[PDB]
Design a protein around this ligand. Structure first.
Ligand SMILES: *[C@@H]1O[C@H](CO)[C@@H](O[C@@H]2O[C@H](CO)[C@@H](O)[C@H](O)[C@H]2NC(C)=O)[C@H](O)[C@H]1NC(C)=O
Ligand SMILES: *[C@@H]1O[C@H](CO)[C@@H](O[C@@H]2O[C@H](CO)[C@@H](O)[C@H](O)[C@H]2NC(C)=O)[C@H](O)[C@H]1NC(C)=O
Ligand SMILES: *[C@@H]1O[C@H](CO)[C@@H](O[C@H]2O[C@H](CO)[C@@H](O)[C@H](O)[C@H]2NC(C)=O)[C@H](O)[C@H]1NC(C)=O
Ligand code: CLR
Ligand code: CLR
Ligand code: CLR
Ligand code: NAG
Ligand code: NAG
Ligand code: NAG
Ligand code: NAG
Length: 953
């Protein structure tokens, strides 16, 4: 069946080389017709659409949350630290001698106040809206979310303890204690605040409120960072969080938030420049990561285009015959190199265009690296074809058409094998949950297929025209005005086969070198197999960005100085009867509630923050609700009047509403079903004052989704992750949170009247990205096994290879792949979707290294194994080296300047390892192992080629 394709491709090659210009036209027309569809490209840069599987669990959990509570707010942080400012001591009253940091000086706080109050009143022009966007339009106001003001926006900073009042910050009082008097300053209020932030009367001889201006308590971990435990006075970093209201991807209010974020960043860069010796400013907006990813994507297009220029230039001056110094410009193949690269770029653009016709949404991070891998695969085929056509000696009085036909018929089955193997590998690499890598894989897969279809028609027609322009004694690209003259046309043997015949093949196939090489490769396989175990599974941030980013400095500070990670909501899905006494007994953590309840379990989890990645015990709306419902003066009903048995708030101090919230309790307080359903909407819309410090509107306003009639559909309990620094930390944190949530639901599902489909799930904003890494290894190994299958299957069918031949190919592919993963674990390249699609591309590509040598060893007539190995090495080892290896390496070595750590790590280093191991195995190890245990001579395999050449000659 090999020689059948030989006959077909002989016929095809002849028929194409006979009609060059017609075939070039008929081949260019569909490429332009498909590649004109690039104008439909919907370039989506948003991280949730590229890097989350929309059918995964995390996305179903996110969808449920974002439905029942609205989406998660956009955090625009600033982490300030004064490194050169020396620590001092304070002899405070009510507390011991505290050692204060340099950052907790007064002038620095007045400078942070200036910045905070400047960013409050920041305004931007909105051309879509044709007005000035104020912060109040877009800011996340937890208290009073409808008709907000600039002094109602969620701005978490140390100076919230002084409600951003500059008079309260410079304020000093005289306090006498146990006979002795001392001057109390802002330090006393700060410390008393950082201890218990839910106070309205400071205890340090000052009637100073501790709650923020917007009316919620600021916990110390949100305001200060760099301390360790309850030693807040030694805080090294101040934090200033601007929380904006997040809206769905299609809301016209998201442009407003992003415009303000851009203005925030401009103001923060100006502020960073102004304060050089004083502060060390680091900052990010929510738009920062999407903007720093897409900045560097358009800055390394010169460094990408240079790769294809260099591959063109190598292929151009590595098929040119340099014998005499008079006909170099006639021998040099500039037209063929240019044409070959043009054909491959045609194929790539056709693929991108075809996929853009179906409305598939890509990103410039995806349409950047597609041409590289497709070209590194597609250039080798053209190189090997032209090399064979060059080496194949023309029969006497034979025309060029039949010669090109014969050369193509000779090398076409091998190129069909390569192209099919690589296309299948890419289309099996396109099973990834990540839509970005899926789009990449599918585009690359089709690009390789169209590359082959163009190489068979357009490039063969082009080679026919080049051969004609050469034989007519005209120049290459300086031709058609210059048929002048040359010395004798046909010259002797080349330098490539010269080297491979006289230096290499005798050296590699020495008495000693076979034993040494074989031993050394088995040792390398052993080391690689050992080292593959210490692979780091996870794509952390600080890789997506460049190395010159303002976000890297922010991430260094966010890792070093921060005291808690992202907040995790333990969302409770539908089918909990919260009203029942038995219901709310298993959620609360007060006197009378069940032991190992919801909040008790989270509390005890946070007691061990290293095992279960939680730093703070969960907030509880039900615990604070049954706390609110006490016979104290928090909720009271009018004893009589027009508002009889109606809620008089904690603010009014009249005698008319002296009646308590419910009856005179005889122990642990529990409201009845009617009492619960009536009094919960009051609790959730009660602002915490001095009189009643317990109130729902502050924290739990949005953490309960009531029905139209006052049934609780859902509810979320807000804990905080410990500071998560690596991708492994994020993944372990998700795993541990899920395990705890499963343990919680297991106990909550044993309550009378709970639906069995009831579930507690820990939704954090970074769940969708770091969920895949729970099961990337099994998926990856299944994928690489499914990619090793068709390689062998089609390698045994198409090439028509025997059993030993197929198994030697397979053994070599497995060896290359294990070596790649071993060196991945050594160099410090992580395991993820990007590394995985590179390894699947490697499984596909390594066939180009092994298959050519193994075939040309199989189709051999030399007496002894060593002679056949030498022949295979010299002829096809030289073709495979000069083609595959040296059209990979000049392309890869240019991506070493990419500047983006993602490409610089996963597409330079990993492809360099893949290429060099491919080279080493399929030019050092495969000749030796073929010379040892290669397949036996098949005379019919070579002798029937002559019943397939002459018959259709
Ligand atoms: C409480 O949860 C309900 C669940 O139905 C939310 O109602 C849905 O809201 C989403 C987003 O606005 C809409 O797409 C659905 O059409 C709504 N469904 C129904 C049945 O009305 C509700 O929005 C949540 N409460 C609040 C105030 O947002
Ligand atoms: C949730 O449990 C409460 C009890 O804690 C149920 O309220 C009772 O419902 C029964 C059935 O009609 C009535 O006879 C009682 O008068 C109600 N009050 C009690 C017993 O406290 C409530 O029905 C349950 N939720 C459901 C089933 O939807
Ligand atoms: C910030 O707080 C200060 C001090 O409380 C406010 O200054 C006023 O506060 C008093 C009571 O509200 C007023 O009666 C005085 O006019 C004044 N007190 C002093 C001693 O100056 C100030 O108004 C607050 N900030 C704003 C702008 O509301
Ligand atoms: C080595 C390079 C030049 C090979 C060609 C790569 C081409 C196909 C890539 C590189 C930059 C890309 C373009 C950059 C952005 C846009 C603008 C958009 O509104 C239409 C698509 C379009 C026009 C892209 C199409 C694909 C593109 C043109
Ligand atoms: C085939 C590849 C090279 C095409 C581009 C892959 C890109 C999109 C991949 C590689 C690394 C990934 C990023 C790394 C981690 C983060 C941080 C997270 O908070 C938002 C998503 C984001 C930003 C990921 C989005 C998708 C990502 C940028
Ligand atoms: C095919 C193999 C044998 C050679 C591949 C090329 C070489 C240069 C590659 C393969 C493995 C790589 C090394 C593996 C990891 C480290 C440790 C690090 O602290 C310094 C760089 C260094 C030393 C890498 C440098 C580049 C490297 C040596
Ligand atoms: C600074 O505070 C630390 C922490 O208590 C203490 O050990 C040390 O003695 C203090 N040094 C000075 C100079 O007061
Ligand atoms: C918008 O804000 C700028 C702040 O520089 C201000 O100067 C300008 O007057 C504002 N636009 C309008 C409509 O007043
Ligand atoms: C408080 O004591 C300080 C320091 O001695 C002094 O300057 C100030 O006048 C005193 N204030 C009052 C109210 O006595
Ligand atoms: C939580 O889960 C189990 C249920 O399998 C429960 O019995 C026990 O209290 C907890 N288990 C562990 C290992 O903490």
């Amino acid at each position: 069946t090999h020689t059948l394709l030989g006959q077909f491709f002989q016929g095809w090659g002849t028929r194409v080389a006979s009609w060059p210009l017609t075939i070039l036209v008929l081949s260019v027309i569909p490429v332009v017709a498909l590649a004109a569809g690039l104008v439909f490209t919907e370039l989506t840069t948003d991280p949730v659409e590229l890097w989350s599987a929309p059918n995964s669990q995390a996305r179903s959990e996110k969808a449920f949350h974002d439905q029942h509570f609205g989406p998660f707010f956009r955090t625009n942080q600033v982490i300030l630290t004064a490194p050169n400012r020396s620590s001092y001591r304070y002899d405070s009253l009510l507390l011991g001698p505290k050692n204060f940091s340099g950052i907790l000086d007064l002038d620095l706080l007045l400078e942070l106040l200036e910045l905070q109050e400047r960013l409050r009143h920041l305004q931007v022009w909105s051309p879509e809206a044709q007005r000035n966007i104020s912060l109040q339009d877009i800011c996340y106001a937890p208290l009073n979310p409808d008709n907000t003001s600039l002094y109602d926006c969620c701005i978490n900073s140390l100076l919230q303890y002084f409600q951003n009042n500059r008079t309260l910050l410079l304020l000093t009082a005289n306090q006498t204690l146990m006979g002795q008097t001392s001057q109390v300053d802002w330090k006393d209020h700060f410390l008393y605040c950082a201890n218990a932030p839910l106070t309205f009367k400071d205890g340090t001889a000052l009637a100073l409120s501790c709650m923020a201006d917007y009316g919620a308590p600021v916990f110390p971990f949100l305001a200060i960072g760099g301390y360790k435990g309850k030693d807040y006075s030694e805080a090294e970093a101040l934090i200033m969080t601007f929380s904006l209201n997040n809206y769905p991807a299609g809301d016209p209010r998201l442009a407003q938030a992003k415009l303000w974020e851009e203005a925030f960043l401009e103001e923060m860069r100006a502020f960073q420049r102004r304060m050089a010796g004083m502060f060390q400013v680091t900052f990010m907006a929510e738009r920062s990561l999407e903007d720093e990813i897409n900045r560097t994507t358009a800055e390394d297009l010169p460094i990408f285009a240079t790769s294809y220029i260099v591959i063109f230039l190598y292929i151009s001056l590595a098929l040119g015959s340099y014998s005499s110094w008079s006909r170099v410009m006639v021998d040099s193949k500039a037209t063929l190199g240019l044409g070959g690269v043009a054909v491959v770029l045609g194929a790539v653009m056709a693929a991108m265009g075809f996929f853009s016709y179906l409305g598939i949404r890509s990103s410039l991070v995806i349409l950047q690296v597609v041409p590289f891998l497709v070209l590194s695969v597609g250039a080798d085929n053209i190189f090997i074809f032209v090399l064979e056509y060059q080496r194949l000696p023309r029969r006497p009085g034979e025309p060029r058409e039949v010669h090109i036909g014969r050369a193509l018929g000779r090398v076409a089955p091998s190129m069909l094998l390569c192209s099919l193997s690589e296309a299948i590998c890419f289309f099996l690499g396109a099973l990834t949950p990540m839509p970005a890598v899926r789009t990449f894989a599918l585009t690359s897969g089709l690009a390789v297929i169209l590359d082959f279809l163009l190489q068979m028609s357009a490039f063969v027609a082009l080679l026919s025209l080049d051969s004609k322009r050469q034989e007519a004694s005209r120049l290459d690209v300086c031709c058609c005005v210059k048929p002048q003259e040359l010395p004798p046309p046909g010259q002797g043997e080349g330098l490539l086969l010269g080297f491979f015949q006289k230096a290499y093949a005798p050296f590699l196939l020495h008495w000693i070198t076979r034993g040494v090489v074989l031993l050394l490769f088995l040792a390398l396989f052993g080391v690689s197999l050992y080292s593959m175990c210490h692979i780091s599974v996870g794509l952390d941030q600080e890789l997506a960005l460049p190395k010159d980013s303002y976000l890297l400095d922010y991430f260094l500070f966010l890792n070093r100085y921060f005291e808690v990670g992202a907040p995790v909501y333990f969302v409770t899905t539908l089918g909990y009867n919260f009203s029942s006494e038995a219901g709310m007994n298993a959620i609360c953590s007060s006197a009378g509630c069940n032991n190992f309840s919801f909040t008790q379990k989270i509390q005890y989890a946070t007691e061990f923050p290293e095992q279960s990645y939680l730093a703070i015990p969960a907030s509880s709306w039900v615990d604070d609700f049954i706390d609110w419902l006490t016979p104290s003066s928090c909720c009271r009903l009018y004893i009589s009047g027009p508002n009889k048995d109606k809620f008089c708030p904690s603010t009014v101090n009249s005698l008319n509403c002296l009646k308590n919230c419910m009856s005179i309790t005889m122990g642990s307080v529990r409201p009845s079903v009617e009492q619960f359903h009536k009094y919960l909407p009051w609790f959730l819309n009660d602002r915490p004052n001095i009189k009643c410090p317990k109130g729902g509107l502050a924290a739990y306003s949005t953490s309960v989704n009531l029905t139209s009639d006052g049934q609780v559909l859902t509810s979320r309990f807000m804990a905080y992750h410990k500071p998560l620094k690596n991708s492994q930390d994020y993944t372990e944190a998700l795993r541990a949170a899920r395990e705890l949530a499963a343990n919680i639901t297991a106990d909550l599902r044993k309550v009378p009247g709970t639906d069995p489909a009831f579930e507690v799930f820990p939704y954090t904003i970074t769940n969708v990205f770091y969920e895949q890494y729970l099961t990337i290894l099994p998926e990856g190994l299944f994928m690489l096994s499914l990619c090793l299958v068709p390689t062998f299957a089609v390698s045994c069918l198409l090439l028509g290879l025997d059993l030993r031949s197929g198994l030697l190919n397979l053994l070599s592919i497995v060896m290359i792949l294990v070596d790649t993963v071993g060196f991945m674990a050594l160099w410090g390249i992580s395991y993820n979707a990007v590394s995985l699609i590179n390894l699947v591309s490697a499984v596909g590509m390594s066939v180009e290294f092994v298959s050519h040598i193994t075939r040309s060893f199989a189709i051999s007539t030399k007496p002894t194994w060593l002679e056949r190995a030498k022949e295979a090495t010299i002829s096809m080892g030289s073709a495979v080296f000069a083609g595959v290896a040296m059209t990979n390496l000049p392309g890869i070595l240019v991506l070493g300047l990419a500047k983006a750590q993602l490409i610089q790590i996963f597409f330079f280093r990993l492809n360099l390892l893949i290429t060099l191991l491919g080279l080493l195995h399929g030019l050092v190890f495969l000749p030796v192992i073929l010379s040892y245990v290669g397949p036996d001579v098949n005379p019919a395999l070579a002798l029937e080629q002559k019943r397939a050449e002459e018959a259709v000659a």
